[PDB]
Amino acid sequence: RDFNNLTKGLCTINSWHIYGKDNAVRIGEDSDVLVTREPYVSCDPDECRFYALSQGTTIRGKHSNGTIHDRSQYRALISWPLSSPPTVYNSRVECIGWSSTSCHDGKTRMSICISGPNNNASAVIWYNRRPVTEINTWARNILRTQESECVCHNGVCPVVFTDGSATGPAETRIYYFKEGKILKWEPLAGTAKHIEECSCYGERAEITCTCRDNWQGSNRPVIRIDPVAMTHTSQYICSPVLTDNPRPNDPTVGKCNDPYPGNNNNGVKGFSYLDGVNTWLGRTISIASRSGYEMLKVPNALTDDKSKPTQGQTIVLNTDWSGYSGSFMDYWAEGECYRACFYVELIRGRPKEDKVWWTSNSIVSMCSSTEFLGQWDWPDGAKIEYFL
Amino acid sequence: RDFNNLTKGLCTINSWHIYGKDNAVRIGEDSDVLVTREPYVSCDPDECRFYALSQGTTIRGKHSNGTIHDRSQYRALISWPLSSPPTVYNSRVECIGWSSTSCHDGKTRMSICISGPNNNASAVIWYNRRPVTEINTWARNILRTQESECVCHNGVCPVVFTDGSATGPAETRIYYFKEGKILKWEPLAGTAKHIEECSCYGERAEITCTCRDNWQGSNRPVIRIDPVAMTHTSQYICSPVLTDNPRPNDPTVGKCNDPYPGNNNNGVKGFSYLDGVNTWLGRTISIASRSGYEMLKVPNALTDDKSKPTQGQTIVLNTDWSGYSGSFMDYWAEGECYRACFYVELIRGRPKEDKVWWTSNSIVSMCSSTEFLGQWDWPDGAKIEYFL
Amino acid sequence: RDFNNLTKGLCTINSWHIYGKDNAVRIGEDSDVLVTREPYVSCDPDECRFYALSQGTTIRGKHSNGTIHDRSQYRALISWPLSSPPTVYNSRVECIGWSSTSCHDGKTRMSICISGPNNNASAVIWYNRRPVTEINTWARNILRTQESECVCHNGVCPVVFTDGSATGPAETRIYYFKEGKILKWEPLAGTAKHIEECSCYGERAEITCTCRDNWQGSNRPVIRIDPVAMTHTSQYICSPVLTDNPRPNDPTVGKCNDPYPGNNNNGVKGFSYLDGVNTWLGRTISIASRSGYEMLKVPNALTDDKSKPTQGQTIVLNTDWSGYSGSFMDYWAEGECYRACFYVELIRGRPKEDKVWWTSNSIVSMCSSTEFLGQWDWPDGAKIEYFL
Amino acid sequence: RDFNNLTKGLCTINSWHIYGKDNAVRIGEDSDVLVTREPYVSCDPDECRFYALSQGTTIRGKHSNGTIHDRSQYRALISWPLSSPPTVYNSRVECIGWSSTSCHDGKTRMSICISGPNNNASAVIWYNRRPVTEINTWARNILRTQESECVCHNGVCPVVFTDGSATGPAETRIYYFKEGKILKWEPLAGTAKHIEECSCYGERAEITCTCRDNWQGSNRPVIRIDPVAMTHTSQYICSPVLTDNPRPNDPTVGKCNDPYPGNNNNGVKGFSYLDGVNTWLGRTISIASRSGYEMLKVPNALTDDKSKPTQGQTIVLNTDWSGYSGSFMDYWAEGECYRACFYVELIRGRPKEDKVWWTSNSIVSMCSSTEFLGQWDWPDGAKIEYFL
Ligand SMILES: *[C@@H]1O[C@H](CO)[C@@H](O[C@@H]2O[C@H](CO)[C@@H](O[C@@H]3O[C@H](CO[C@H]4O[C@H](CO[C@H]5O[C@H](CO)[C@@H](O)[C@H](O)[C@@H]5O)[C@@H](O)[C@H](O[C@H]5O[C@H](CO)[C@@H](O)[C@H](O)[C@@H]5O)[C@@H]4O)[C@@H](O)[C@H](O[C@H]4O[C@H](CO)[C@@H](O)[C@H](O)[C@@H]4O[C@H]4O[C@H](CO)[C@@H](O)[C@H](O)[C@@H]4O[C@H]4O[C@H](CO)[C@@H](O)[C@H](O)[C@@H]4O)[C@@H]3O)[C@H](O)[C@H]2NC(C)=O)[C@H](O)[C@H]1NC(C)=O
Ligand SMILES: *[C@@H]1O[C@H](CO)[C@@H](O[C@@H]2O[C@H](CO)[C@@H](O[C@@H]3O[C@H](CO[C@H]4O[C@H](CO[C@H]5O[C@H](CO)[C@@H](O)[C@H](O)[C@@H]5O)[C@@H](O)[C@H](O[C@H]5O[C@H](CO)[C@@H](O)[C@H](O)[C@@H]5O)[C@@H]4O)[C@@H](O)[C@H](O[C@H]4O[C@H](CO)[C@@H](O)[C@H](O)[C@@H]4O[C@H]4O[C@H](CO)[C@@H](O)[C@H](O)[C@@H]4O[C@H]4O[C@H](CO)[C@@H](O)[C@H](O)[C@@H]4O)[C@@H]3O)[C@H](O)[C@H]2NC(C)=O)[C@H](O)[C@H]1NC(C)=O
Ligand SMILES: *[C@@H]1O[C@H](CO)[C@@H](O[C@@H]2O[C@H](CO)[C@@H](O[C@@H]3O[C@H](CO[C@H]4O[C@H](CO[C@H]5O[C@H](CO)[C@@H](O)[C@H](O)[C@@H]5O)[C@@H](O)[C@H](O[C@H]5O[C@H](CO)[C@@H](O)[C@H](O)[C@@H]5O)[C@@H]4O)[C@@H](O)[C@H](O[C@H]4O[C@H](CO)[C@@H](O)[C@H](O)[C@@H]4O[C@H]4O[C@H](CO)[C@@H](O)[C@H](O)[C@@H]4O[C@H]4O[C@H](CO)[C@@H](O)[C@H](O)[C@@H]4O)[C@@H]3O)[C@H](O)[C@H]2NC(C)=O)[C@H](O)[C@H]1NC(C)=O
Ligand SMILES: *[C@@H]1O[C@H](CO)[C@@H](O[C@@H]2O[C@H](CO)[C@@H](O[C@@H]3O[C@H](CO[C@H]4O[C@H](CO[C@H]5O[C@H](CO)[C@@H](O)[C@H](O)[C@@H]5O)[C@@H](O)[C@H](O[C@H]5O[C@H](CO)[C@@H](O)[C@H](O)[C@@H]5O)[C@@H]4O)[C@@H](O)[C@H](O[C@H]4O[C@H](CO)[C@@H](O)[C@H](O)[C@@H]4O[C@H]4O[C@H](CO)[C@@H](O)[C@H](O)[C@@H]4O[C@H]4O[C@H](CO)[C@@H](O)[C@H](O)[C@@H]4O)[C@@H]3O)[C@H](O)[C@H]2NC(C)=O)[C@H](O)[C@H]1NC(C)=O
Ligand SMILES: CC(=O)N[C@H]1[C@H]([C@H](O)[C@H](O)CO)O[C@@](O)(C(=O)O)C[C@@H]1O
Ligand SMILES: CC(=O)N[C@H]1[C@H]([C@H](O)[C@H](O)CO)O[C@@](O)(C(=O)O)C[C@@H]1O
Ligand SMILES: CC(=O)N[C@H]1[C@H]([C@H](O)[C@H](O)CO)O[C@@](O)(C(=O)O)C[C@@H]1O
Ligand SMILES: [Ca+2]
Ligand SMILES: [Ca+2]
Ligand SMILES: [Ca+2]
Ligand SMILES: [Ca+2]
Ligand SMILES: [Ca+2]
DSSP states (O other): OOOOOOOOEEEEEEEEEEEOOOOOOHHHHTOOOEEEEEEEEEEEEOEEEEEEEEEEEEESGGGGGGTTTSSTTTTTTEEEETTTOOOOTTTTEESSSEEEEEEEEEESSSEEEESSSTTEEEEEEEEEEEEEEEEEEESSSSSSOSSSSSOTTTTEEEEEEEEESSSEEEEEEEEEEEEEEEEEEEEOOOOOOOOSEEEEEEETEEEEEEEEOOOOSOOOOEEEEETHHHHHHEEEOSSOOSSSSOOOOSSSSSSSSSSEEEOOSSSOOOOEETTTSSOEEESSSOSSSEEEEEEEEOTTTTTOTTTSEEEEEEEEEEEEEOOEEEEEEEESSSSSSEEEEEEEEEETTTTTTTTTOOOEEEEEEEEEESSSSOOOOOOOOHHHHHHH | OOOOOOOOEEOOSEEEEEEEEEOHHHHHHOOOOOEEEEEEEEEEOOOEEEEEEEEEEESSGGGGGTOSSSSTTOOEEEHHHHHSOOEEEEEEEESSSEEEEEEEOSSEEEEEEEEEOOOOEEEEEEETTTTEEEEOSSSSSSSSSSSSSSOTTTEEEEEEEEEEEESSSEEEEEEETTEEEEEEEEEOOOSOOOOSOEEEEEEEEEEEEEOOOOOOOOEEEEEEEEEETEEEEEEEEEOOOOSSSSSSOOOOSSOOSOOOOOSSSSSOOOOOOOOSSEEEEEEESSSSSEEEEHHHHHHHHOOOOOOOOOOEEEEEEEEOOOOOEEHHHHHHSSSSSSOOOEEEEEEEEETTTTSOOOOEEEEEEEEEESSSSOOOOOOOOOOGGGGG | OOOOOOEEEEEESEEEEEEEOOOHHHHHHHSSEEEEEEEEEOOOOSEEEEEEEEEEEEESSSSGTTTOSOTTOOOOEEEEEESSSSSSSOOOOHHHHHEEEEOOOSEEEEEEEESSSSEEEEEEETTTTTEEEEEEESSSOOOOOSSOOOOOOOOTEEEEEEOOOSOOEEEEEEEETEEEEEEEEEEEOOOOOOOOOOEEEEETEEEEOOOOOSSSSSSOEEEETTTTTEEEEEEOOOOOOOOOOSSSOOOOSSSSSOOSOOOOSSSOOOOOOTTTOOEEEOOOSSSSSSSEEEEEEOOTTTTOTTOSSEEEEEEEEEEEEEEOEEEEETTTTTSSEEEEEEEEEHHHHHHTTSSOOOOOEEEEEEEEESSSOOOOOOOOOOOOGOOO | OOOOOOEEEEEEOOOEEEEEOOOOOOOTTTSEEEEEEEEEEEEOOEEEEEEEEEEEEESSSGGGGTTTTTTOOEEEEEEEETTTOBTTTTTTEESSSSSEEEEEOOOSEEEEESSSSSSSSSEEEEEEEEEEEEEEEEEOOBBBSSSEEEEOOOOOOEEEEEEEEESSSSEEEEEEEEEEEEEEEEESSSSSOOOOEEEEEEEEEEEEEEEOOOOOOOOOOEEEEEEEEEEEEEOOOOOOOOOOOOOOOOSSSSSSOOOOSSSEEEEEEEOOOOOOOOOEEEEEEEESSEEEEEOOOOOTTTTTOOOOOOOEEEEEEEEEEEOOOEEETTTTSSEEEOOEEEEEEEEEEETTTSSSSSSEEEEEEEEEESSSSOOOOOOOOGGGGOOO
């Protein structure tokens, strides 16, 4: 109808309730489920769906061997009905590639997929299911994007890309698209030293992205975008409650404008909702691997370098595998505020479970509740032994 | 369009004709059919569909092992086209959880799923396929609901929940929802001593629920709800024709305001249509197990403590497995009256058939006819031996 | 929109072109295809679909054993997209039963399914996907119907049923339905001595049905219905070109008002288009079994007891299995005339191919062309050996 | 709505970006994927889909044995969602046959399928999913058509057919259809000596077809059609950059009005976009077999007999199998010009990979970009060894 505008503030987050879960690996043990990774969730005005990068093979298929690799010509961004598994028969291909983002602007959806060799990748921006714009690699080193939904405001949908090193300074750009066409792009500015896989959400005409400093930071970089002025700023979450992985143990004081050191050249896509006292951080429980997942209420995490948790909720036990996590909200729901939501990628197989030759995942997602709900843990649920 | 109002009375029930049957277990022996239990049927203004709690695995899948358990993180309320089996590819997830109800109010559908550990479960109320309200456990002992459709009148959709003991007094509540929001809730009142899994239907602005007294009663408790005043009453079906299972043999006089004793701490979800002389009761044939199924015309069963059958119809032979049964009607059909319908869950596998490691079911359903139709029996139809 | 009226005459039939073919048995050798029999084709104003009586099991499934039997509680009328195979995932259940008919009246579709034991069957008439009317068996001996589409005119959709003996006089009735309700019914009248499985079509406000005299006739009985007056007549196709199976060899003179003798208590559903010189008859090539299939132009077959063929077209070689055949037309196509169409059921498995334990079929269908098209033969195409 | 008119010119082709890829063979190793060949892509005003000639069997199915053959009664034109594989459950049958074309005129789609024995084939023209016209073979020698989309302008959709010899002069005809009816047909005229499998596109009220001279030419014949005057001309691409396969090595001077000799009685469906300096040619890399695939910018190829490449893009490495290739464009996209697109059929199995008994393919397709994008190669990706 009309372009959606971020007119509401976030609802108060007092706990998280179960939103969706596809049990993909369990089901796929005996049904035609596509091998995936890098999933996320995104809503249209009339439906919310699961998204992920298929590996172009089923889990039981012989071609599942080798799916630990991230980039091949057989990957594609696919979407499917909320909480269903990504099957060969119900998956809809949005575009071809090994890195992506997607978001609905209120009128129609924009999907972006990047493909190519490491030194010659290119992004193609789709709008209303048609290719509209193409952007060639600018640093010739794995042009890559969010791996979770972008956000729009009055037709303008900003997207964060990075091209260049994963272990040193790189060239990050914020592109402002409208109807799949480039209105403008800026180089990253601010104090964030390295940006990758931004998880974003919007509220009151502002877009907040919590990203991954793969190079040096165990605290997460944050990019705040003004989609009207088409400008942005960057910093890190000040809080000592560190949320990347692997990471050192939490200190008593964090860092607001530099990566918190201790772990180099590695990380995991993650997210947060930064909203004063209504601030919640997601992170793996393990400081060593993508194991477990929890949400922590850390009032003023973004700006308070001594902020510590005041409440929490375990999502996945540290005795279960987790993975990527990102933000999304249903901007078309009823009510006076936007309900914060997130998903956690539950990776199965390689490298942690090497008895199988494949790597895939399933999805679990939650949304906030103003109630103080009882908690449960939500593991993938599949038995590797069954696949042997 | 507009909210549906229960303006009609029930059609005269002279017999039951076949409405739907999915042959899920038969078909699933060699196709991707999800393991389920606790099924039901519910209509939208333009379509009637099958519903059930998936176990998040196919029947032939290795994860079918252990599906005798009722509550896990892999269950979800799913719906699928009338008389099709619940397959991985045609099942639509309504919400995540291990106990549910769902009903269309004329404008859109409300679905409710409860999930959690036994001592910390929570219900999330979905409306128009979005989460709207959440209710935390109040007795910290398996918050649970109907396992069959709720009923609406002018936007108000009452739902019966129970939290606490399955073998002693518990805390039952009647919630009155409108557009997924709570208008009001009451504690159970009346003479029903224990309430579980209410089967409901509506006629002439009144909602009647036939439930399960798991603690002491072999006769069934009944809750009558006024969805306008948002009040209710409770009692038991007076009739000596006992309809829970297991149960003692039928006496000559029943009980109107106390559980009829003889069997404790067990039962099965069931239903009835209480409409004066146009009264029909469903029950398993066996007094020992979920075996067989029959419909009995017992004029004035609700209020006559000596009422006995005047007509009947066998649905499932006592040489075949049955299970849960509940009520539903198509409130959007043509005509001057509501046609009473019901489904019977035909459980296969554990515990009665232990040669297989799984537990699932198929569905059979009937609706009333004003004709006096010839009868047939409707078994699940699968051969366990084939799954060995 | 408005009820369709049979306002056009048939197009001139100069040959038959290929319309649809699903290759169900071939495909089903390695995919989830339902075992069926008694298929047909029927059109809605916006789509034409395949129909058949499922056996409630896939062909490769272990439950395919025994599917040679005609009536069980696991059968159902299902429809699916034109030329697709009837799979577990794309088949839509119209109703439950082991005998059926279905037709669209221009506004919505009426489907009828009969189920029950042999001595207590009942038909339930569905309209707009809801059960509306039920008819109990009147002769307590396998109440049965067309097994192909019915035809409507101004809302009135006549349907031919038979109850009683398959090897002696039976009770055939013509029911005139409108919106699923019975307007009127008549007993069969005229000279047809036994009626079963009528294949019907309509043109210029008249409905013509070519049926099966199972008891004595090798020539086919014909019922002509006036859907406005709601009256009918019956006779046999006069022509010596005999079209039932098994049958004696063709004589030089046929019979107009009595069954042509030679073969008792057996037959096969078949059809014809009786339109003066524009008359075509379908029949199996073999006089012994459901083998081969051909179309023969026999000018004035209905009324000329010496009529012989003037043109022909082989549909299935006598070295391939055939089966049932029936009529349908797309009453919603463009143009000034109705294009005659028909389907042939290609039965595979039992009894003719006993190396497999199942019985199923695939479908081939053609429609007329005013051109004189070259011919091809259209076999099922599956190799039984593959299923062993 | 209204018939589409070719009002735009082509966009400037500076490179090719990835548009769709289904990875059919990879996926089909362990899922119900239909065996196909002769694929293409075609757009409706609201969706773009993949098309191909199914072989009426899955790849893993036993009936895949023998699918190297081109014409059988089990083939059919099917379409399915962009970039999905052609599965038993998501494929839509357009018509029955072993040679086809299809195109949307802006209001609805016309599909054409030819079937029959070699000496008695016939084409049936479908419009709005109904059969409308039939054309009998005129030379009694494999009546055949494009194997890629036709193009329409103001309701008129020209289609090129050929009947007669594949190794000598044949009878090619250009039929001008409107709403599935024949407005007119012409015999081929011009200097093209043999025409087969035309790949066409339209721009500025002109339709250009690049075909296959199977008899003598290694350069490609070209047919330019005026869909308003309903007339055409034919010649060959003048350029020495030869694009059929097998072929001799490129000379320094080509031929404008005669086949370029060196290879007889063989070829492959191919295409080009002839637009002055904005001219691009597709061809296999190998001059011996359907191996590899590349796009070459050859300014004025059509009219310059000495034209050589000025730019290029590899699509498939010469170490990978290719196959047919053809043109299509989304005539309903936004913007001021038509974006040239094409697909390449990646054939797997027989005859080149004889360890398996089947022959199938997958699809890759690209569209032009005004950017100068980095390139990647796009192989089928399946491991034959897995199918053994
Ligand atoms: C049914 O469901 C409900 C709902 O879920 C269940 O209740 C939930 O229970 C969970 C688990 O207990 C709670 O989660 C934890 O929350 C605490 C925060 O709450 C405590 O602290 C608050 C703040 O206190 C300080 O400030 C306040 C405010 O000014 C001040 O008042 C106070 O005096 C003090 O100065 C308190 O307000 C709060 O009190 C309230 O609630 C109590 C119950 O929760 C109640 O008893 C009180 O009466 C009062 O009403 C409470 O005391 C989080 O701190 C905690 O997170 C830490 O712990 C988990 C392990 O449990 C760990 O994984 C987290 O990462 C985190 O700890 C790590 O990080 C810290 C920060 O750097 C670090 O300091 C720690 O050492 C630790 O670090 C190590 O681990 C990490 C991760 O591996 C690693 O990276 C580091 O390097 C290092 O190795 C939990 O989130 C929920 O809040 C609670 N929800 C609700 C609504 O109640 C209920 O239990 C269920 N019922 C049943 C029967 O099961
Ligand atoms: C073709 O299809 C048609 C349609 O389906 C088939 O016909 C149907 O046939 C079935 C089976 O026969 C019928 O079902 C039974 O119905 C009877 C009720 O009908 C009888 O009783 C009526 C009431 O009589 C008393 O009151 C009346 C009224 O004031 C008074 O007139 C009379 O004198 C007497 O005082 C009679 O009206 C009725 O008569 C009419 O119909 C006759 C045919 O049905 C006809 O002959 C007559 O001329 C007249 O027209 C008739 O006599 C039910 O009582 C019965 O249910 C009991 O039996 C089944 C086993 O069959 C059992 O499973 C049930 O649970 C129940 O019995 C248990 O519960 C009782 C109550 O507590 C208890 O007393 C019993 O001891 C027994 O208890 C034990 O078992 C249970 C369960 O395991 C356990 O929990 C207990 O602890 C204990 O162990 C059937 O429902 C249909 O009504 C009938 N339908 C129609 C339309 O006719 C036809 O047969 C088919 N054709 C063919 C060829 O197959
Ligand atoms: C490319 O495609 C085209 C299009 O399909 C192919 O051409 C088609 O070819 C087929 C096969 O040949 C034709 O089918 C047969 O048609 C004949 C009818 O046509 C003949 O007879 C006409 C009528 O003649 C009498 O009346 C006329 C009219 O007044 C009068 O003129 C004439 O003198 C005579 O008095 C002739 O008009 C007609 O002539 C025209 O066409 C000729 C070509 O067809 C051409 O040469 C002529 O110049 C002229 O232009 C022609 O002579 C059917 O009779 C025949 O059906 C019988 O035969 C098949 C076996 O072939 C059998 O299965 C049928 O059941 C039937 O025979 C049984 O039933 C009879 C009736 O009771 C009985 O008498 C027979 O003994 C036999 O009975 C036995 O078998 C049955 C079944 O098993 C059993 O039940 C009995 O008990 C008993 O055992 C075919 O249908 C098409 O018409 C023709 N189509 C067209 C448009 O041309 C072309 O061949 C293909 N090209 C290639 C290269 O392959
Ligand atoms: C990241 O991505 C980018 C984007 O894809 C990658 O860059 C691309 O790189 C590829 C591969 O190198 C390029 O493809 C080739 O393009 C050349 C054409 O370009 C050259 O020639 C131009 C024309 O020159 C003449 O005319 C001009 C104009 O008047 C005049 O200026 C000039 O002096 C001369 O007189 C030059 O303009 C052009 O220069 C520009 O670009 C250069 C880089 O490309 C740059 O260095 C310059 O500074 C300048 O900016 C350039 O020199 C094609 O000719 C070539 O195709 C031939 O070669 C391939 C094998 O590579 C072969 O398969 C083709 O079939 C073809 O060769 C066959 O056919 C010929 C014609 O008959 C024949 O002559 C050959 O002998 C050969 O024939 C044999 O093989 C065939 C097939 O098997 C067989 O049938 C025959 O019988 C026989 O056996 C390629 O298409 C892209 O253009 C380029 N794209 C862009 C935008 O730059 C980049 O590399 C990637 N980065 C990384 C790090 O990997
Ligand atoms: C485009 C791409 O290759 N993305 C990959 C990124 C990058 O390697 C890192 O961000 C370093 O830049 O991380 C992953 O490997 C990971 O950690 O699981 C997965 C993902 O596929
Ligand atoms: C929420 C829940 O666990 N419900 C379960 C109930 C309760 O156990 C009983 O009502 C006692 O409260 O009964 C079942 O076990 C049963 O009898 O088959 C199935 C169902 O899943
Ligand atoms: C309702 C029913 O049983 N119909 C069956 C009929 C009847 O047996 C005959 O018409 C005799 O009445 O014929 C079949 O067996 C047959 O010949 O293949 C199939 C069909 O299922
Ligand atoms: Ca399978
Ligand atoms: Ca890091
Ligand atoms: Ca009880
Ligand atoms: Ca007969
Ligand atoms: Ca050639």
